[PDB]
Paper text:
Here, a series of new methods are presented based on the use of a low X-ray-background film as a crystallization support and a photoablation laser that enable the automation of major operations required for the preparation of crystals for X-ray diffraction experiments. In this approach, the controlled removal of the mother liquor before crystal mounting simplifies the cryocooling process, in many cases eliminating the use of cryoprotectant agents, while crystal-soaking experiments are performed through diffusion, precluding the need for repeated sample-recovery and transfer operations. We have previously shown that the transfer of crystals to X-ray data-collection pins can be automated through the so-called CrystalDirect approach, which relies on the use of a thin, low X-ray-background film as a crystallization support from which crystals are recovered by excising the film with a laser beam and attaching it to an X-ray data-collection pin. The CrystalDirect system enables the automation of sample mounting and cryocooling and can contribute to closing the automation gap that currently exists between crystallization and X-ray data collection.
Some of these crystals grew in conditions that require the addition of cryoprotectants when processed by standard manual methods. However, in all cases tested the automated laser mounting and direct cryocooling after liquid removal with the CrystalDirect robot produced samples with very good diffraction properties leading to high-quality structural models.
Residue numbers in the entry: -1 to 160
The structure:
């Protein structure tokens, strides 16, 4: 019955500055990503709410993740600060031990004109805590692969998301 939070933070960088990344990778994710990378994401569907805080959306993956799915609740969005926070409320990463995972994606500017893409994962734990580096890294790599696809597209299509 011990409740705790395990926090993991990772970053990487992009030549694309925060406004363009946020508009595409975050704000237009539901339309952009299945169009760009159908094998990753088949579709995204709002179950409830209008797009703000409290919205509940289900993401159905493509073949790359066996047409599985996740359901997310939007926790916050701070468009001027390029910050998006959401919680996993259904998915394979939940378990008896892990009741919820709360995330933040924050885009920070660098003085070279680029972005730092920061990802924070907060695992809400119950009982004994057993969190494996392998599962955390697999998560990290799935995020970055997906991000890199969107980045690829934006570089190839410089008129979109201006």
């Amino acid at each position: 019955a011990m409740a705790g939070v395990f926090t993991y933070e990772t970053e990487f960088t992009s030549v694309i500055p925060p406004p363009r990344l946020f508009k595409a990778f975050i704000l237009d994710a539901d339309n952009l990503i299945p169009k760009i990378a159908p094998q990753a994401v088949k579709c995204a569907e709002i179950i409830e709410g209008d797009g703000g805080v409290g919205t509940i959306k289900k993401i159905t993956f493509g073949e790359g993740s066996q047409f599985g799915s996740v359901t997310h609740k939007i926790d916050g969005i701070d468009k001027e600060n390029f910050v998006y926070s959401y919680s996993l409320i259904e998915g394979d990463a939940l378990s008896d031990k892990i009741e919820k995972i709360s995330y933040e994606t924050k885009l920070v500017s660098s003085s070279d004109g680029g972005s730092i893409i920061k990802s924070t994962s907060n695992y809400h734990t119950k009982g004994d805590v057993e969190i494996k580096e392998e599962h955390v890294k697999a998560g990290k790599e799935k995020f970055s692969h997906l991000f890199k696809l969107v980045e690829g597209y934006l570089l190839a299509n410089p008129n979109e998301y201006c």
